[PDB]
Amino acid sequence: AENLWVTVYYGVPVWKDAETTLFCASDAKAYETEKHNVWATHACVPTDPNPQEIHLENVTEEFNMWKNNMVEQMHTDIISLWDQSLKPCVKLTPLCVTLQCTNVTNNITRGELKNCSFNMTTELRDKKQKVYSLFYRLDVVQINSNKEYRLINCNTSACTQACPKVSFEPIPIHYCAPAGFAILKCKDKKFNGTGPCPSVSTVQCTHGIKPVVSTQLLLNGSLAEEEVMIRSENITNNAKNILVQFNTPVQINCTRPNNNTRKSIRIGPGQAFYATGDIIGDIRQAHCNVSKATWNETLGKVVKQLRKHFGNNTIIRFANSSGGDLEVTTHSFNCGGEFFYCNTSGLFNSTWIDSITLPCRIKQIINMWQRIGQCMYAPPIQGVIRCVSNITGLILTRDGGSTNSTTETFRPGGGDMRDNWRSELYKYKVVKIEPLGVAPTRCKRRV
Amino acid sequence: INCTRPNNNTRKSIRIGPGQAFYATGDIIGDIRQAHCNVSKATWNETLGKVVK
Amino acid sequence: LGFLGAAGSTMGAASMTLTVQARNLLSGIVQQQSNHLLKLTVWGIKQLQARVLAVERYLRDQQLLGIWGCSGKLICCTNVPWNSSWSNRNLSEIWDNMTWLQWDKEISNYTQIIYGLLEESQNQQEKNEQDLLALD
Amino acid sequence: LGFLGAAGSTMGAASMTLTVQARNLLSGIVQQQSNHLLKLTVWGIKQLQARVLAVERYLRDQQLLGIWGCSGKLICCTNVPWNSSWSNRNLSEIWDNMTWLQWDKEISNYTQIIYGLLEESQNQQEKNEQDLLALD
Amino acid sequence: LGFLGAAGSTMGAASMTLTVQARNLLSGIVQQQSNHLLKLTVWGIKQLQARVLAVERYLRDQQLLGIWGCSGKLICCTNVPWNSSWSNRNLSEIWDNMTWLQWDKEISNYTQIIYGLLEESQNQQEKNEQDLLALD
Numbered sequence A: 001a002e003n004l005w006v007t008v009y010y011g012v013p014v015w016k017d018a019e020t021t022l023f024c025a026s027d028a029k030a031y032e033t034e035k036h037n038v039w040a041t042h043a044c045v046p047t048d049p050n051p052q053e054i055h056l057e058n059v060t061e062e063f064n065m066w067k068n069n070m071v072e073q074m075h076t077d078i079i080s081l082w083d084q085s086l087k088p089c090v091k092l093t094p095l096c097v098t099l100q101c102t103n104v105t106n107n108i109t110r111g112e113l114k115n116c117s118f119n120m121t122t123e124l125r126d127k128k129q130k131v132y133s134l135f136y137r138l139d140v141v142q143i144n145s146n147k148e149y150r151l152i153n154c155n156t157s158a159c160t161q162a163c164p165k166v167s168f169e170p171i172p173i174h175y176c177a178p179a180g181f182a183i184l185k186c187k188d189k190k191f192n193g194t195g196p197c198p199s200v201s202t203v204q205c206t207h208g209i210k211p212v213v214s215t216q217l218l219l220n221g222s223l224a225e226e227e228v229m230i231r232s233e234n235i236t237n238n239a240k241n242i243l244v245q246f247n248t249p250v251q252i253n254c255t256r257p258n259n260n261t262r263k264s265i266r267i268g269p270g271q272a273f274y275a276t277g278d279i280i281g282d283i284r285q286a287h288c289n290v291s292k293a294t295w296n297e298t299l300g301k302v303v304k305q306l307r308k309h310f311g312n313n314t315i316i317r318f319a320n321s322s323g324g325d326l327e328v329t330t331h332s333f334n335c336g337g338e339f340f341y342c343n344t345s346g347l348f349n350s351t352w353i354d355s356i357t358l359p360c361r362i363k364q365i366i367n368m369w370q371r372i373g374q375c376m377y378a379p380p381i382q383g384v385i386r387c388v389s390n391i392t393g394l395i396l397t398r399d400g401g402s403t404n405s406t407t408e409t410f411r412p413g414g415g416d417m418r419d420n421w422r423s424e425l426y427k428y429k430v431v432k433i434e435p436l437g438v439a440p441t442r443c444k445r446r447v
Numbered sequence B: 001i002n003c004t005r006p007n008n009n010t011r012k013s014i015r016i017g018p019g020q021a022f023y024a025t026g027d028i029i030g031d032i033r034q035a036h037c038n039v040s041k042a043t044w045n046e047t048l049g050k051v052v053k
Numbered sequence C, D, E: 001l002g003f004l005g006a007a008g009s010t011m012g013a014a015s016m017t018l019t020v021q022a023r024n025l026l027s028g029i030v031q032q033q034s035n036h037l038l039k040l041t042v043w044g045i046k047q048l049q050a051r052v053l054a055v056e057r058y059l060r061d062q063q064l065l066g067i068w069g070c071s072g073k074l075i076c077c078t079n080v081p082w083n084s085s086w087s088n089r090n091l092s093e094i095w096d097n098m099t100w101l102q103w104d105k106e107i108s109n110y111t112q113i114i115y116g117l118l119e120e121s122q123n124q125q126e127k128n129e130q131d132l133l134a135l136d
C-alpha cells in the first residue's frame, strides 16, 4: 500500500511577509567624494553593479503601499543621517543678541530685506566688534516702537550653522535586504498601490531612490509608465491625500535671482559665521516659471483619471491651499543649497465640465522634520543661483463639503514628508525566506 | 511608614538661555511646617521584639 | 533558472533546485561584508545587527535539522507516519499540481506537532542503535 | 520534564532526554532578539555581545564533536579504549547510581587527554577509509 | 608539529595533520573573548567585527562542504571525474613532490568550475537515493 511518511526538504522556495532592517548602498563613483559631504558617501557601502532580478513565473502577491514599513526606515535613516551631518558644525548661540535694523538701500520692486547691526565677539574673549548683515524679514522679529530686533529662534533654541562644504543634494540611495530576506518588485504597469500584483520579480537591491524634500509637488522622482496614475488609501475619506503621478514630466525652472555676497565674521577661536554681506545688483523677487500649455494639458489628463473614480458628470475644480503657516501652505523646497517657499496659487484654479510665474519667499533659519529643539541656519550662497527640475506628480486633498454632490474641489495638499519617497516604495515588498518544509511520500529510513 | 513635605510649594521658570529654563522655588503658599515621617509605635516596638529574638 | 525562480512551479519539479535557495540563505552576507574608517559607526551597527540575525536564522535551521536524523542533507526520508489529519489530499495531487507557497499554508496548523514527533522518534532511535553497538 | 529537569537523575535515565538541553542551548536567543531605535545603544551592545558569545559556544561544541566522527549525533560510540586510570568505578555503579553532575567532577582531570585520543583515532581512520575507497 | 608546521611539506605527508589547521580556524577566538565596562567602546567594536567575520568564514566553509556530500569529514572521496584540463600533471608527482602552497596556484583558475560539478552531482544523487528509499 501507499503508506505515507513525512519527509523533510531544506532550501524549499517559500517565504512570509516580515519587518527587517534594510541597509543602504551608494553609487561606487560618488563614493570617491570627500567624507560626510551629502548622505554617507563614504560610510554607505558602494553599489552592487547590477539589480540581479529574476522574474518569478505564475506567482501572484499582495502588495500594499500605505502599510509599507520600508518607508519608515527611509524616514528614520534620513532624520538620523541629517543630524549626524550637523553635529560637527558651529552652534550659533553667540549670534543671539539685540539687533538694530533699517530697510535695504538700493532699488526694490517692498521692505522684505532688513539691514541689521549688532555687537559680536572676536576670538579674544575681552574684545568685541560692531558689525552688520542683511536678513530676510522671516528670519527676525521686533521686540520694540523703538527699532530693536532679535532672531526668530532666540526664544526657543540655538540653531547650528550648516557646514558650507556639505551639500544637501539628493544622491541616489539603493536599499538592499540582508541574507535570508528578499525584495519583491511588482512589475505590473497598472498597479494602483493595493492588491494582487500578477507579475513579480525578486531583486537584491532597489533602483536608486533620491531623498528629495518638497510639499505640494513631487520633484525629480520616477514617472508613471503609460498614463497619469492616481493612488489613495481609501478614497471616500477626506483625511487621506491623493497621490498623483505623471506620465510626462512637467519642466519647472526656478531662480533666486539676485547677485548676493558672502561675508565671514570670526565669532570665536576657530569659529566663523557667514553674514549676508551685500547685494551687488538692484533687487528682484525670487520666482519659478512653468510652460503654460504643458500645465493646462497635464491637468486635462489628471481630470480624465479623477473622472473615473468620482463619475463622469462631476464638475471637478481646483483651488489653492486654504491658509495657515508658510511651511504647510506653499511649495517648501530647496534649490542649489537655498530654501524656497513658493505661492502655487497661480496653478490651482481651473474648472472642468507662455509661462506661469510663481513668486517666492526665502528663509535662512529653518526646521525641516519639525523638531522642537533642533534648528538650522543655512548660510547664504554666493552670486546668482537657478535650477531646473521635473515635476513628477503632486499631492492633492479633496475638501469635505456637506454640499451639492455634483462637484469636487481639490487643493494642493501640503502633505507629510514621507510621500516624497512613498511615491517610489509603492512597487517594493520585503519577505523572509522559510527554507525548511515537510511533505508526505512513500519512502522509509533504513533500520 | 508615611512621610510628607508637607508645605504648599510653588514652581517658577527662569529662561536662562535660548531654549533653556531653570526651575526656581518661587514661594510657599501656606505657613511653614517641617518635613516629617510617621510610624505606628506599637508595630515598631513589637518588630524589634522579633529582631532581638 | 536563478534565486527563487521555481517558486511558481509545482512542488515536483521545484524539488531539484533546492541548492540555489540553500546557498543564498547565508552567502548573501557578501553584500554587507564588502565595506567610514570609524565615523558614522551607526551604519556599521545597522549592518552588524543584520549579520548576527542572518547567522542565527541559518544556525537554528541547521540545529533543528540536526536533532532530527537529517544533518547535512537537502532531502531526507524519515520513520514517522503521515496522519491524514495533517492533510486529506492524496499524494499525487500535491506533487503534481500545488506550488510550495500553496502547500505551506495548507499544512501551517499541524507543523509544530510534526517536529515533536520527529524529534522523539530520532532520540529513541539513536539509543536503540547504541543498544545494538553494545554487542555488534 | 522541563529544561535541566533530569540534572539530579541517575545518568542512565538522564540519557533519554538529551534533546531538552540541546534545543535550549541556542534557541533561547528568542528572549534577546525580541527588541530605543538607536539611543541607549549600550543596551543593544549588551544584547549583541551576549548573542555572539552564545553562537561561538555552540559552534565550538559542534566543531569539536565534528573533528571526532560524531557530527549530527547526540549519542556516539567510538573506537578508543577506557583506561581504568580515568575511573576505577565499575560500569554498573556509574550508570545505575551517579548523577551527571557527580560524574563530571569525578573524571574532570583526564578530559583533555581523552579528547586528544579521540581526535587522533579519527583522522588516521578517515585516511584508512580512503585507502580502501582508492580500490573500491 | 604545531599550527601550519606542514606548509612546506609535500602534499602527501601534509594530509595526516589537517585537524591542526582545522581546530585553530575558529577556536583562536580564545584571544578575543579573554576580555573598560563600556568606555573606549570602539576597541569592543574592533574585536566584535573581527569575531563575526571569523564565524562567517568558518560557517561558509562548513555550508559549502555540506551542499557537497562531505559535511563533518576532513577527507572526502566523490563521484565526479578529474578532467586533465584542470591539471596535466600525473597523480604521483603531485602527491610526491609539490607543497600545498604550490598546488593551489597551479589549479587556481579551474576551482569555480569544479565546485559546480560537485554541487549538481550531489543534489541529483540525493534524489536518486530517495527514488530508491521510496521502495527500499
Ligand SMILES: *[C@@H]1O[C@H](CO)[C@@H](O[C@@H]2O[C@H](CO)[C@@H](O[C@@H]3O[C@H](CO[C@H]4O[C@H](CO)[C@@H](O)[C@H](O)[C@@H]4O)[C@@H](O)[C@H](O[C@H]4O[C@H](CO)[C@@H](O)[C@H](O)[C@@H]4O)[C@@H]3O)[C@H](O)[C@H]2NC(C)=O)[C@H](O)[C@H]1NC(C)=O
Pocket: A320, A321, A322, A323, A329, A343, A345
Ligand atoms: C488663495 O487664493 C486667494 C484668492 O487670491 C488668496 O486670497 C488673497 O490673500 C491676500 C493675502 O491675505 C489678500 O490681500 C490682503 O487683504 C487684506 C484685507 O483687505 C481688506 O481690508 C483692509 C484693512 O481693513 C483694507 O485696507 C482693504 O481695502 C480691504 O478692504 C489686507 O489687510 C492685506 O494688506 C497687506 O497687503 C497690502 C498689499 O498692498 C499692504 O498695502 C498692506 O500694508 C498689508 O501688508 C492684503 O491686501 C487678498 O485680498 C485675498 N484675495 C481675495 C480675493 O480674498 C489666498 O491668500 C491664497 N492662499 C495662499 C496661501 O496664497
Ligand SMILES: *[C@@H]1O[C@H](CO)[C@@H](O[C@@H]2O[C@H](CO)[C@@H](O[C@@H]3O[C@H](CO[C@H]4O[C@H](CO)[C@@H](O)[C@H](O)[C@@H]4O)[C@@H](O)[C@H](O[C@H]4O[C@H](CO)[C@@H](O)[C@H](O)[C@@H]4O)[C@@H]3O)[C@H](O)[C@H]2NC(C)=O)[C@H](O)[C@H]1NC(C)=O
Pocket: A164, A165, A167, A169, A170, A212, A219, A220, A333, A334, A335, A336, A337, A386, A387, A388, A389, A390
Ligand atoms: C532636480 O534635478 C536637477 C538635475 O540633477 C537639479 O539641477 C541641478 O542642481 C545642481 C545642484 O543640486 C546644480 O549643480 C550646481 O552647479 C553650479 C555650477 O557648476 C556647474 O555648471 C557649470 C556650467 O554652468 C560647470 O562649469 C560646472 O562644471 C558644473 O557642472 C555649482 O557651482 C554648484 O556647486 C558646486 O560649486 C560650489 C562653489 O565652488 C561648491 O560649494 C559646491 O560644493 C559644488 O562643488 C553645483 O554643482 C546643477 O547645475 C543643476 N542642473 C540644472 C540643469 O539645473 C535640481 O537641483 C533638482 N531639484 C531638486 C529640488 O532636487
Ligand SMILES: *[C@@H]1O[C@H](CO)[C@@H](O[C@@H]2O[C@H](CO)[C@@H](O[C@@H]3O[C@H](CO)[C@@H](O)[C@H](O)[C@@H]3O)[C@H](O)[C@H]2NC(C)=O)[C@H](O)[C@H]1NC(C)=O
Pocket: A098, A099, A100, A117, A118, A119, A129, A130
Ligand atoms: C554695538 O557696539 C557699540 C560700541 O560697543 C555700542 O555703542 C553704544 O554707544 C552709545 C553712544 O551713542 C553708548 O551710550 C549711550 O548712548 C545713547 C545715545 O546713543 C544715550 O541716550 C545713552 O545715555 C548712553 O550715553 C552706549 O552705552 C554704547 N553701548 C554699549 C553696550 O556700550 C552699541 O550699543 C552696540 N549695539 C548693539 C545693538 O549691540
Ligand SMILES: *[C@@H]1O[C@H](CO)[C@@H](O[C@@H]2O[C@H](CO)[C@@H](O[C@@H]3O[C@H](CO)[C@@H](O)[C@H](O)[C@@H]3O)[C@H](O)[C@H]2NC(C)=O)[C@H](O)[C@H]1NC(C)=O
Pocket: A141, A155, A156
Ligand atoms: C517666541 O516668539 C514668538 C514671537 O513673539 C511667539 O509666537 C507668536 O508669533 C506670532 C508670529 O510672529 C505672533 O502673531 C500671531 O500669530 C498667529 C499664528 O497662528 C496668528 O494667528 C495671529 O494673527 C498673529 O499674527 C504672536 O503674537 C506670537 N505670540 C504668541 C503668544 O503667539 C512665541 O509664543 C514665543 N515663544 C516663547 C516660548 O517665548
Ligand SMILES: *[C@@H]1O[C@H](CO)[C@@H](O[C@@H]2O[C@H](CO)[C@@H](O[C@@H]3O[C@H](CO)[C@@H](O)[C@H](O)[C@@H]3O)[C@H](O)[C@H]2NC(C)=O)[C@H](O)[C@H]1NC(C)=O
Pocket: A192, A193, A194, A195, A196, A231, A232, A233, A234, A235
Ligand atoms: C486598487 O485596486 C484594488 C483591486 O486591484 C481595489 O480593491 C478593492 O477591494 C475592496 C475590499 O473591500 C472591494 O470592495 C468591497 O469589498 C467588500 C468585502 O470586503 C464587498 O462586500 C463589496 O462588494 C466590495 O467588493 C473592491 O471590490 C475591490 N475593487 C475595487 C474596484 O475597488 C482597490 O479599491 C483599488 N484602490 C484604488 C484607490 O484604486
Ligand SMILES: *[C@@H]1O[C@H](CO)[C@@H](O[C@@H]2O[C@H](CO)[C@@H](O[C@@H]3O[C@H](CO)[C@@H](O)[C@H](O)[C@@H]3O)[C@H](O)[C@H]2NC(C)=O)[C@H](O)[C@H]1NC(C)=O
Pocket: A104, A105, A106, A115, A116, A132, A134, A277, A278, A279
Ligand atoms: C547696510 O548698512 C551698512 C552700514 O554699515 C551699509 O554699509 C556701509 O557702511 C559703512 C560703515 O561701515 C558706511 O560708511 C562709510 O561711507 C563712506 C561714503 O563715502 C565710505 O567712503 C567709507 O568707506 C564707509 O563705507 C557706508 O556709508 C555704508 N554704505 C552705504 C552704501 O550705505 C550698507 O551699504 C547698508 N546696505 C546694504 C545693502 O548692506
Ligand SMILES: *[C@@H]1O[C@H](CO)[C@@H](O[C@@H]2O[C@H](CO)[C@@H](O[C@@H]3O[C@H](CO)[C@@H](O)[C@H](O)[C@@H]3O)[C@H](O)[C@H]2NC(C)=O)[C@H](O)[C@H]1NC(C)=O
Pocket: A343, A345, A346
Ligand atoms: C499668492 O498669490 C495671490 C495672487 O492671486 C495673492 O493674493 C492677491 O491676489 C489678487 C488677485 O487675485 C491681487 O489683486 C490686486 O490687489 C490690489 C490690492 O490693493 C488691487 O489694487 C488690484 O486691483 C488687484 O485687485 C492681490 O494683489 C494679491 N495680494 C497680495 C498681497 O499680493 C496672495 O496674497 C499670495 N499669497 C500670499 C500668502 O501672500
Ligand SMILES: *[C@@H]1O[C@H](CO)[C@@H](O[C@@H]2O[C@H](CO)[C@@H](O[C@@H]3O[C@H](CO)[C@@H](O)[C@H](O)[C@@H]3O)[C@H](O)[C@H]2NC(C)=O)[C@H](O)[C@H]1NC(C)=O
Pocket: A349, A350, A351
Ligand atoms: C484663476 O486665477 C486667475 C489669475 O489670478 C484669474 O484671472 C483673472 O480673472 C478676472 C475675472 O474673470 C479677469 O477679468 C478682469 O480683468 C480686468 C483687467 O485686468 C480687471 O480690471 C478686472 O478686475 C478683472 O480682473 C482677469 O483679466 C484675469 N487675470 C488674468 C491675469 O488673466 C481667474 O479669475 C481665477 N479663477 C478662475 C476660475 O480662473
Ligand SMILES: *[C@@H]1O[C@H](CO)[C@@H](O[C@@H]2O[C@H](CO)[C@@H](O[C@@H]3O[C@H](CO)[C@@H](O)[C@H](O)[C@@H]3O)[C@H](O)[C@H]2NC(C)=O)[C@H](O)[C@H]1NC(C)=O
Pocket: A056, A057, A058, C005, C006, C007, C008, C009, C010, C013
Ligand atoms: C509556470 O507554470 C507553467 C504551467 O504549469 C509551467 O510550464 C510547463 O507547463 C506544461 C504544460 O503546458 C507542463 O507540462 C508539460 O507540457 C509539455 C508540452 O508543453 C509536455 O511535453 C510534457 O509532457 C508536460 O505535459 C510542464 O510540466 C510545465 N513546466 C514545469 C517545469 O513543470 C512553468 O514551468 C511554471 N514556471 C516555473 C518557473 O516553473
Ligand SMILES: *[C@@H]1O[C@H](CO)[C@@H](O[C@@H]2O[C@H](CO)[C@@H](O[C@@H]3O[C@H](CO)[C@@H](O)[C@H](O)[C@@H]3O)[C@H](O)[C@H]2NC(C)=O)[C@H](O)[C@H]1NC(C)=O
Pocket: D005, D006, D007, D008, D009, D010, D013
Ligand atoms: C530523584 O531521585 C529519586 C530516587 O532515585 C528518583 O525516583 C525514583 O526512585 C526509585 C527508587 O526509590 C528508582 O528505582 C526504581 O523504583 C521503581 C518503583 O518506583 C521500581 O519498580 C524499580 O525497580 C526501581 O527500583 C527510580 O529509578 C527513580 N526514578 C528515576 C527516573 O530514576 C527521582 O525520579 C529523581 N528525580 C528526577 C527528576 O530524576
Ligand SMILES: *[C@@H]1O[C@H](CO)[C@@H](O[C@@H]2O[C@H](CO)[C@@H](O[C@@H]3O[C@H](CO)[C@@H](O)[C@H](O)[C@@H]3O)[C@H](O)[C@H]2NC(C)=O)[C@H](O)[C@H]1NC(C)=O
Pocket: E005, E006, E008, E009, E010, E013
Ligand atoms: C622540508 O623538506 C624536506 C625535503 O623533502 C623534508 O625532509 C625529508 O626529506 C627526505 C629527502 O631528503 C624525504 O625522503 C625520504 O627520506 C628518508 C630518510 O629521511 C628515506 O628513508 C626515504 O626513502 C625518502 O628518501 C622525506 O620524505 C622528507 N620528510 C618528510 C616528512 O616528507 C622535511 O620534512 C620538510 N619539512 C617539513 C616540516 O615538512
Ligand SMILES: *[C@@H]1O[C@H](CO)[C@@H](O[C@@H]2O[C@H](CO)[C@@H](O)[C@H](O)[C@H]2NC(C)=O)[C@H](O)[C@H]1NC(C)=O
Pocket: A101, A102, A103, A111, A114, A145, A147
Ligand atoms: C521699513 O519701512 C516701513 C514703511 O516705511 C516702516 O514701517 C512704518 O514705520 C513707522 C515708524 O516706525 C510706523 O509709524 C508705521 O506704522 C510703519 N508701518 C507699518 C505698515 O508697519 C518700517 O518701520 C521700516 N523698517 C525698518 C527696520 O527700517
Ligand SMILES: *[C@@H]1O[C@H](CO)[C@@H](O)[C@H](O)[C@H]1NC(C)=O
Pocket: A251, A252, A253, A289, A290, A291, A355, A388
Ligand atoms: C528652463 O530654462 C532653459 C534654459 O533657459 C529653457 O531651455 C527652458 O525652456 C526653460 N523652461 C521653462 C519652463 O521656463
Ligand SMILES: *[C@@H]1O[C@H](CO)[C@@H](O)[C@H](O)[C@H]1NC(C)=O
Pocket: A312
Ligand atoms: C464614464 O466614461 C467612461 C469612458 O467613456 C465609460 O467607460 C463609462 O461607462 C462612463 N460611465 C458613466 C456612468 O457614464
Ligand SMILES: *[C@@H]1O[C@H](CO)[C@@H](O)[C@H](O)[C@H]1NC(C)=O
Pocket: A259, A280, A383, A384
Ligand atoms: C555678481 O557681481 C560681481 C561684481 O559685479 C561679478 O563679479 C559677478 O560675476 C556677478 N555674478 C553674476 C552671476 O552676474
Ligand SMILES: *[C@@H]1O[C@H](CO)[C@@H](O)[C@H](O)[C@H]1NC(C)=O
Pocket: A220, A249, A388, A389, A390
Ligand atoms: C526629466 O525628464 C526627462 C524625460 O526624458 C528625463 O530625461 C530627465 O532625466 C528628467 N530629469 C531632469 C532633472 O531633467
